[PDB]
């Protein structure tokens, strides 16, 4: 058992000298009474992996009959609070909540839905579905079904099932047939067979899709991206382009979401928090590399320019270093 939630390029790793008891006691002393030692909280939680944080949570419950997340919510405020609670939340539960949050109210955050459902693996998606049910007592699919529609809805429902092929094997025969199908379902006909785009881009493994995009280019003499932009529109178009970019370079896709979250008028702290926390033990190092390659400046400096206080320090600790 390797964590489906832990990858090879994260910025946060297991603290080797970890002691749950010592950490829980330190956290308790830090929030206990008037004031809060935010510095102590930062020092500990950003320097422990999520798995260790879960052990601290368990220990804190045992020793104080208190839920660590509730004490954090009672003492902390703002972005710093949200970030800190995010850090102590199990990964599948964090994603499930982010998903609920993106569908909550009169509006839907299509970009957040796209981001999460396209970057999570089938295994993580199965975990997220289970967590969603546990926390909401409703399936993710039911919620998606009700807050979206059209082709966008159908593609999100296919991804939420976590049925994408996980095999390591590829089928050149299959890649050619699929590339022919995509060609025939789009460019080669008036209108588009949207369902066929959804089926192939959502159920074939990433490796398989990379072959299919090569064959497609051969058949059509155009990139799959060109076809998608010409045949589709709206959120559906955005979702399929997201799938293509993730197949080719997931860290660059996420580097781009971070970039938009930090630029313009007003930082999108929720996108920032989500990406920083959820990819910290997976590929934040690669996201850093891509961000710098694409924008010319490191993620570390982007954080430093648009954020401040304890919130900034925590993000910088998660970030891990400059590039
Ligand atoms: Ca306090
Ligand atoms: Ca809504
Ligand atoms: Ca067409
Ligand atoms: Ca159609
Ligand atoms: Ca278009």
Swiss-Prot record:
Annexin repeat boundaries on the chain: 18-89, 90-161, 173-245, 249-320
Identify residues that carry N-acetylalanine.
2
Quote the protein name from its UniProt record: Annexin A3
| Function comment | Inhibitor of phospholipase A2, also possesses anti-coagulant properties. Also cleaves the cyclic bond of inositol 1,2-cyclic phosphate to form inositol 1-phosphate.
Matching entries from InterPro entries are given as:
Annexin, Annexin_repeat, Annexin_repeat_CS, Annexin_sf, ANX3
GO BP terms, alphabetized: defense response to bacterium; neutrophil degranulation; phagocytosis; positive regulation of angiogenesis; positive regulation of DNA-binding transcription factor activity; positive regulation of endothelial cell migration
- Tell me the protein family, please: Belongs to the annexin family.
Which residues in this protein are found as Phosphothreonine? 267
Keywords, in A-Z order? Acetylation, Annexin, Calcium, Calcium/phospholipid-binding, Phospholipase A2 inhibitor, Phosphoprotein, Repeat
Q: Which PROSITE patterns match?
A: ANNEXIN_1, ANNEXIN_2
Query: What's one Pfam family the UniProt record gives for this protein?
Result: Annexin
Domain-level remarks: A pair of annexin repeats may form one binding site for calcium and phospholipid.
């Amino acid at each position: 058992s390797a964590s489906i939630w832990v990858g090879h390029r994260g910025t946060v790793r297991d603290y080797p000298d970890f002691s749950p008891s010592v950490d829980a006691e330190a956290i308790q002393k830090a929030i206990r009474g008037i004031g809060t030692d935010e510095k102590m909280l930062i020092s500990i939680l950003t320097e422990r992996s999520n798995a260790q944080r879960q052990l601290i949570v368990k220990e804190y419950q045992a020793a104080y009959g208190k839920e660590l997340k509730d004490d954090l919510k009672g003492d902390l405020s703002g972005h710093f609070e949200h970030l800190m609670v995010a850090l102590v939340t199990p990964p599948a539960v964090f994603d499930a909540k982010q998903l609920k949050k993106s569908m909550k109210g009169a509006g839907t955050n299509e970009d957040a839905l796209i981001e999460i459902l396209t970057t999570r693996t089938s295994r993580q998606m199965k975990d997220i579905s289970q967590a969603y049910y546990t926390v909401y007592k409703k399936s993710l699919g039911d919620d998606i079904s009700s807050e979206t529609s059209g082709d966008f809805r159908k593609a999100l429902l296919t991804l939420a099932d976590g049925r994408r092929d996980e095999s390591l094997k590829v089928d050149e025969h299959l890649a050619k047939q699929d590339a022919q199908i995509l060609y025939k379902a789009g460019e080669n006909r008036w209108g588009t067979d949207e369902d066929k785009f959804t089926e192939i881009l959502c159920l074939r493994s990433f490796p398989q899709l990379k072959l299919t995009f090569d064959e497609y280019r051969n058949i059509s003499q155009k990139d799959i991206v060109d076809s998608i932009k010409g045949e589709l529109s709206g959120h559906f178009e955005d979702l399929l382009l997201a799938i293509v970019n993730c197949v080719r370079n997931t860290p660059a896709f996420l580097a781009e979401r971070l970039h938009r979250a930090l630029k313009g008028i007003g930082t999108d702290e929720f996108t920032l928090n989500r990406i920083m926390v959820s990819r910290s033990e997976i590929d934040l190092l690669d996201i850093r590399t891509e961000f710098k390659k694409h924008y010319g400046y490191s993620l570390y400096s982007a954080i430093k320019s648009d954020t401040s206080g304890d919130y900034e320090i925590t993000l910088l600790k998660i970030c891990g270093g400059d590039d």
